[PDB]
């Protein structure tokens, strides 16, 4: 182990008043999918999820548009994979209040965000339990589901009684 022929190479570097271009600082990062991640694929700095699409592109295109003229599909240059673009922030927030001199606790409603915690058809509702019976509702929410304060006593959500 001390007299065998070893191949020894030396990689020296040059430093002068010349542009540095043989070096490549750009590094191809990991591909992440189904998460709200910012990307810059050659034409835009867009933030959104990258789902697995089922539509193929013709072998000369790089981008993808829709009926509303929005970039929602970009081919991945790493492996020629077609990925969709969908924004993450949807709608605002809403708060259910039983009223003055009735209760103190409130329930928070998300408009178009997908998730004690009940996944209603009108977004995410947190802070109000779901009960299968149906009464006449007073506080409208949407998609046929209301909220109310009944029996201690807490805020409940149910399908409205017609």
């Amino acid at each position: 182990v001390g007299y065998q022929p070893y191949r020894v190479v030396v990689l020296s570097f040059e430093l002068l008043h010349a542009p540095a271009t043989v070096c490549g600082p750009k590094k191809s990062t990991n591909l992440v999918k189904n998460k709200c991640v910012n990307f810059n694929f050659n034409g835009l700095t867009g933030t959104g999820v990258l789902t697995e699409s089922n539509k193929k592109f013709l072998p000369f295109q790089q981008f993808g548009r829709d009926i509303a003229d929005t970039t929602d599909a970009v081919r991945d240059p790493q492996t020629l994979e077609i990925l969709d673009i969908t924004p993450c922030s949807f709608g605002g927030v809403s708060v259910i209040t039983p009223g003055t001199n009735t209760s103190n606790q409130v329930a928070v409603l998300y408009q178009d965000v997908n998730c004690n915690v009940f996944q209603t058809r009108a977004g995410c509702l947190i802070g109000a339990e779901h009960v299968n019976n149906s009464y006449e509702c007073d506080i409208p929410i949407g998609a046929g589901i209301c909220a109310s304060y009944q029996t201690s006593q807490s805020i409940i959500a149910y399908t409205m009684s017609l």
Partner: antibody, heavy 120, light 110 residues
Framework: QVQLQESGPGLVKPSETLSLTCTVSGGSVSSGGYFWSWIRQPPGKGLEWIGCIYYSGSTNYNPSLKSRVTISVDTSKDQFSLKLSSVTAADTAVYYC????????????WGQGTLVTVSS | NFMLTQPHSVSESPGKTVTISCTGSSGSIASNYVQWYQQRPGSAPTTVIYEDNQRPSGVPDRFSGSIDSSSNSASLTISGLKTEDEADYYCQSYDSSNVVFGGGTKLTVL
């Protein structure tokens, strides 16, 4: 930043199978082109290197611990686990999950060591 | 069959400059990079030097390392010993796809 946390039971019977998983938060397993390594340290003795893994199937093992280590990487759960076979009474060591910046370099970040004891 | 030889017990009063060695048996000590780890009792080890002469950001400048390749020994020089310095010191190697650690040196005080 990024941290490493271990899990799994602190006990294993002799001549059994060990299952300890090290989870990662604040980073990605397959991103950055880094390595993962398991290092053990018995109480009162020096550190012992078990093996190192890549986010692909590349593995290299200690010849004293060869044919007994089984380490796998699951990118979906952002964690990697080590499996040990034929554990004996001399395997009492504090197991450290340390990220390895450079293969022949140093483990820049070390996870907290779980205590593993064996008894019959 | 490459193992790092490290002094088991090194003891010194605070304030003097002490040297911790790490000798390789078969392979030369300049063949691969050697990393020193200072580990507190009941705590995870922490890297205190890298590339045999470079101190990572956070450790004091007194963690100076030197390489004596003729004797195949890696040296770590500690100057200005303090109370918190009482910890286990291990030297790392790589050999050939097989990371080998050192014997261990507790920094005992006088």
């Amino acid at each position: 930043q990024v941290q490493l946390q271990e899990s799994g039971p602190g006990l294993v019977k002799p001549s059994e199978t060990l299952s300890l998983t090290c989870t990662v938060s604040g980073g990605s397993v397959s991103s950055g082109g880094y390595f993962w390594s398991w290092i053990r340290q018995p109480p009162g003795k020096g550190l012992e290197w078990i093996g190192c893994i890549y986010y692909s199937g590349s593995t290299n093992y200690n010849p004293s611990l060869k044919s007994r280590v089984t380490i796998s990487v699951d990118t979906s759960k952002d964690q990697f686990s080590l499996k040990l076979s034929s554990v004996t009474a001399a395997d009492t060591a504090v197991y450290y999950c340390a990220r390895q910046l450079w293969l022949r370099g140093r483990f820049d970040y070390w996870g907290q060591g779980t205590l593993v004891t064996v008894s019959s | 069959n490459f193992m790092l030889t490290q002094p088991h017990s090194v003891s010194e009063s605070p304030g003097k400059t002490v040297t911790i060695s790490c000798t390789g048996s078969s392979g030369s000590i300049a063949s691969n990079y050697v990393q020193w780890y200072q580990q507190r009792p009941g705590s995870a080890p922490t890297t205190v030097i890298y590339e045999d002469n470079q101190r990572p950001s956070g450790v004091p400048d007194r963690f100076s390392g030197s390489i004596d390749s003729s004797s195949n020994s890696a040296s770590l020089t500690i100057s200005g010993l303090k109370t918190e310095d009482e910890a286990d010191y291990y030297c790392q190697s790589y050999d050939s796809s097989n990371v080998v650690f050192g014997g261990g040196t507790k920094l005992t005080v006088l």
